[model samples]
Target: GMPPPADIVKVAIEWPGAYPKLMEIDQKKPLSAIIKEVCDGWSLANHEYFALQHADSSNFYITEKNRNEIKNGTILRLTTSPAQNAQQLHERIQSSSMDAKLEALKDLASLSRD
Candidate 1:
């Protein structure tokens, strides 16, 4: 799919170790912080406070859907008023060091590990 306009702040900066250049940088981010920052910057540009950075899109989608599970005791809303989900989403992006949102996929991969 195409992406949102540069000024729209409408695209998610996916952190797949898939990109070779990013892969090189990914090696340094055992915690994935650098990637997360880039993700956050992207989010800021897009006006999203809580950003979610991950090794792949699969994880990002899963995490976006189940943010409540990540840090229990937090209110996970299906929709909102002041846009809390956006805030949480950006926070999610900031904190992701490695596989922040793709725990499910990682779990699956580990299960498949032979």
Candidate 2:
């Protein structure tokens, strides 16, 4: 089996219409940079609108908070949806006060029910 370097993490990127691409990313790089690389490699015209998420959990890996959680052989799904925005708001609600959480909940309510 081909193994990655110490600083590199091998991951699978799965898009809706294309086959999954196995990519090696530097663990030290920012999440945005990794996303950009994946998008460009796939020749996605709307690269900025696409994000990577856990294939099973549908959790986005756009922020540093969850970037460290990515490991070798991880499978991620590429998508263009407001779910990531909702996840961010969910996190905000998680760490907010009762009143703030209510506001964040209201924000979540306004998201598309897809």
Candidate 3:
């Protein structure tokens, strides 16, 4: 008989000026629970102040709405401030394809207006 698929997903959690930490997370768990665990692993105080962000999509892992978007080997960054987020988006606009650049520009424009 074939083995059943695992519910856990392996991902890399990154922080500035540090190596990415690999973690196996249960897909059924809430993102907040995952964030708390990551914070504990890093010994970061105030887990509420930190959030997990998808490196490629720049989407925060805060809700179950997009939980399934995260898959095995996904890279999640620990984000604390909006400045870093804006900088990353700026860099994306500068380095990505035309379509991606336009998308990033739209994001920037919306952020600016808000």
Please rank every candidate by TM-score, starting with the best: 3, 2, 1
- Candidate 2 C-alpha lDDT tens digits along 1-114: 997547677899898778998897776786667777888877876666767778856576545667666788988877774643444333445555544443434334555766
Q: For each candidate, give its TM-score against the true structure.
A: 0.19, 0.58, 0.60
Name the Cα RMSD for model 1.
21.0
Regarding TM-score, does 1 or 3 come out ahead?
A: 3
**Steric collisions counted per model:** 11, 0, 0
Model 3 C-alpha lDDT per residue in residues 7-90, reported as the tens digit of each score: 788999888777898997787887778888888887888776667788867676545666677789998887764433333443
User: lDDT of all predictions, in order shown?
Assistant: 0.32, 0.71, 0.74
Winner on lDDT between 1 and 3 is 3
lDDT of 1 by residue, 14-93 (tens): 32342222222222232235334544443433323333433332333213233322231221111111333433443445
Task: Show model 3 residue runs off by greater than 4 Å.
Answer: 1-3, 58-62, 81-114
Preferred candidate (lDDT higher): 1 or 2:
2
Deviating ranges (above 4 Å) for candidate 2: 1-5, 58-60, 81-114
Compute the lDDT of residue 46 as modeled in candidate 3: 72
Error of 2 at 59 (Å): 2.9
